[PDB]
Design a protein around this ligand. Sequence first.
Ligand SMILES: CCCCCC#CCC#CCC#CCC#CCCCC(=O)O
Length: 264
Amino acid sequence: DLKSLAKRIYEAYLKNFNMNKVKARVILSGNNPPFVIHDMETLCMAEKTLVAKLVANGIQNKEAEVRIFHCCQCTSVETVTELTEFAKAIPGFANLDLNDQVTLLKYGVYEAIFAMLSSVMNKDGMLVAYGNGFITREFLKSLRKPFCDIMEPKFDFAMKFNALELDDSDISLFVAAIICCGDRPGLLNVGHIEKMQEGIVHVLRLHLQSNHPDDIFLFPKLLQKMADLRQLVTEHAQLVQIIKKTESDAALHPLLQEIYRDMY
Ligand SMILES: CCCCCC#CCC#CCC#CCC#CCCCC(=O)O
């Protein structure tokens, strides 16, 4: 039954996420290839084609850094939607109380977002806009503070995560395991969530043993990556709060504001 469950998780991940690691590698390796954004000129060209509405305001357009942060937030919002539908494939998740489903998604979504962002990152940049742009790591580092500090730690996480050479069948179960953490603040039925976690982690452990016979420590490596992601998200929320306090034009999407609210 456990091999079947791993396959059901994988198929739900292929169905629910617009981007997966195979589809990202096809693009990253060179009809509508991605537009390369490496400087302000190419950012502005890409925006005029790919997010025309955001730059249709003339002198009232926001600063480039704010537009970029807005685009990242739109990606997070879309990924929340995808993750919410994916979670239904996890045994036991849809049987939880509605409020526990909300709590698990609230704390898990950004950990999952940053885990999956690795699939669209290489050491030089990241795919954006449904695979139609590639923005360079150096260009993001060149932005004015604090905005140059947003993505770089996510690239740092991703380069080491990508060196584990996981595939989509692994990542789907890793994302399911992120969502099933029984220690999230405020859960009502911890016991049932712990059992749900145990089940998915069991599926993950057996799958990794099969799919990665060459790396006997891959399971504990991934347990550590889950802890690293929790710390990455805590730090990310702190930076977002700095932006909220000091950057009046950098409007936070209400869905994301709610996710952040009372989180850490
Ligand atoms: C025309 C396309 C222009 C591309 C502009 C760009 C770009 C860079 C990018 C990107 C994809 C992403 C993402 C998820 C995230 C995050 C953390 C921050 C948001 C949040 O706090 O939610």
